[PDB]
């Protein structure tokens, strides 16, 4: 199947790697029982103005995000750096819930990289924002027949806000070059303006309640987690593991790495997590990949035999996988270490060939001086390759050998001179017609 052919010539072929498979799955989340207070965020009698937007900290609780659909009749989340359906599988150091009221045509401004009056003077999201924006129409609560003027936004400001910066100042704004002296004049405006939310307004002019959930998915200790039961901690076995949402497969062993208290994960050169602090016991654990290695198949031609020998490359014969059952080791075929002869080479463990003390010319190279051949009952044998026969030269101070005859030899040397000249119609190959 690797060669995509039904016939194989004599040789050695690199097939897929073997891999020890995880025996179980481990989940390790912090011991937290309190439920996060999302009810009082989405069920407030009145929301703040966007210029004076409220920020609430969520910590040390269990966050089930599927209950947010019950507190408010919004149609969907709008999340960044995360999907709404994966929130329950994750852990965060903190959560912040920002809540305010804007009008419908400004909701597009609650997003990273936006400009406009709201995004520049009232509420600004960072370009690297990770979190979710939940907005829903609130015409039935924030509108009045005479108009609702309790909700305000900043219209004038000397400079744009930084991300997550709040400005509740009410100093008179100077649009011209004359001083204002704390008085609204001609180019001196009061910086705040009120929405006039009326029930008769069109959709884009209607009030919308917005909740912004911001969190951190970077490696750090976590106190907000989704609904997820923890299993026990299994060491010295190949397992699937989940530490605070960080998933992977490998063997967990006790670590002597000295994490600082703010460190939950350790990363290697390839930015892969190779160390983790257990969220419950607070112990440091090393992560190592389970077990793997290259497999080569040594065959004479299928015209000769269907017998093969297998080389486990760069591997102790004792670490050759012996995992029982087909779900603990890929590939699922098995070659018995006792059934077929086992030989240790510096290139790895060779199974299926008998090593012999004779030395022959190399037929199928295995590596590190070992070659294999199909010889006599015919079977695959392994041997140390022969460099040739020894010849002691009868040298002395006064001895010479002089030929008395000669042989006229005619030998052949083959040299490539040219290769096939090819032409490609780029458009035909790529685009057809």
């Amino acid at each position: 199947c690797t060669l995509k052919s039904f016939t194989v010539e004599k040789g050695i072929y690199q097939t897929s790697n073997f891999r020890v498979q995880p025996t179980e799955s481990i989940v390790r989340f912090p011991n937290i029982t309190n439920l996060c207070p999302f009810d009082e965020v989405f069920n407030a009698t009145r929301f703040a103005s966007v210029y004076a937007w409220n920020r609430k900290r969520i910590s040390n609780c269990v966050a089930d995000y599927s209950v947010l659909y019950n507190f408010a009749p919004f149609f969907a989340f709008k999340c960044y750096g995360v999907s709404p359906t994966k929130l329950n599988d994750l852990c965060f150091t903190n959560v912040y819930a920002d809540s305010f009221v804007i009008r419908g045509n400004e909701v597009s401004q609650i997003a990273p990289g936006q400009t406009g009056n709201i995004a520049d003077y009232n509420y600004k999201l960072p370009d690297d924002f990770t979190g979710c924006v939940i907005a829903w129409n609130s015409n039935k609560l924030d509108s009045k027949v005479g108009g609702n003027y309790n909700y305000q936004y900043r219209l004038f400001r000397k400079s744009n806000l930084k991300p997550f910066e709040r400005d509740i100042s009410t100093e008179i704004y100077q649009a011209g070059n004359k001083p204002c002296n704390g008085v609204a004049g001609f180019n001196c405006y009061f910086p705040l303006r009120s929405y006039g939310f009326r029930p008769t307004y069109g959709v884009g002019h209607q009030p919308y309640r917005v909740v912004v959930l911001s969190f951190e998915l970077l490696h750090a200790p976590a106190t907000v987690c989704g609904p997820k039961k923890s299993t026990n901690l299994v060491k010295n076995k190949c397992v699937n593991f989940n530490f605070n949402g960080l998933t992977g497969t490998g063997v967990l062993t006790e670590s002597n790495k000295k994490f600082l208290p703010f460190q939950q994960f350790g990363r290697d050169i390839a930015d892969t997590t190779d160390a983790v602090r257990d969220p419950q016991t607070l112990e440091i654990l090393d992560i190592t990949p389970c077990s793997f290695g290259g497999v080569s198949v040594i065959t004479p031609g299928t015209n000769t035999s269907n017998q093969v020998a297998v080389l486990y490359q760069g591997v102790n014969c004792t670490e050759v996988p012996v995992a029982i059952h087909a779900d603990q080791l890929t590939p699922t075929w098995r070659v018995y270490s006792t059934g077929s002869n086992v030989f240790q080479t510096r290139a790895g463990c060779l199974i299926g060939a008998e090593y012999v003390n004779n030395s022959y010319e190399c037929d199928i190279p295995i590596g590190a001086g070992i070659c294999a051949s199909y010889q006599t009952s015919q079977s695959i044998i392994a041997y140390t390759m022969s460099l040739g026969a020894e010849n002691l030269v009868a040298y002395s101070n006064n001895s010479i050998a002089i030929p008395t005859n000669f042989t006229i030899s005619v030998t052949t040397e083959i040299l490539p001179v040219s290769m096939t000249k090819t032409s490609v119609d780029c458009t035909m190959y790529i685009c057809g017609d």
Partner: antibody
Amino acid sequence: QVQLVESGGGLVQPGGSLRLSCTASGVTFSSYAMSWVRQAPGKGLEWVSGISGSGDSTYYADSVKGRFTISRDNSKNTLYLQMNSLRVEDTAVYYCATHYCSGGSCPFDYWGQGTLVTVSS
Amino acid sequence: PSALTQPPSVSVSPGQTASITCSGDKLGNKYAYWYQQKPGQSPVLVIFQDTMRPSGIPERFSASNSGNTATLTISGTQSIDEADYYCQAWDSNTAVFGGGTKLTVL
């Protein structure tokens, strides 16, 4: 409420033998590594031996090596310290302490009351 | 490491600051653990992993481990804090303790 109760301590003649037993309650016994630590009257604390969570790996101090043997029964939630060839220096109050690991990142979070092994003639 | 050197005794008046030290070869490269043992009582852990305290240990307790020494500082030493404090570390799956220090409260 985690509770470690010790038993099996008494007077022995030198060269005799004992078996200490430590029983844990109100805790997952298999999830903890266990250890024996002794304190002679007036002297300091000395780690005697410790056993892994499953009991597959065992560790002993040099002054106690070969002589003592530590085992555990996860079904009974009990830790055993088989004591033999007890020399005079072995007189101390013996504690059993639970810890999650022995790689360096875990403390002895729970200690027992302590059992006395006095050896003399 | 292998020998955690510790002063015999530290004498402190109520409300003063006690500073019990633990010395060992490059002790700053390992985690440090402090236990408080009272007369006729079992040991009680008060510091784990250098500077962390178990739940229920009074906030007055503090510790550090830099260089080749680890120190335990009970600020505002009260009469209750009179006890025998110990210092512990791990080495090759073996626990190593310090000699011990009695905090004599005046």
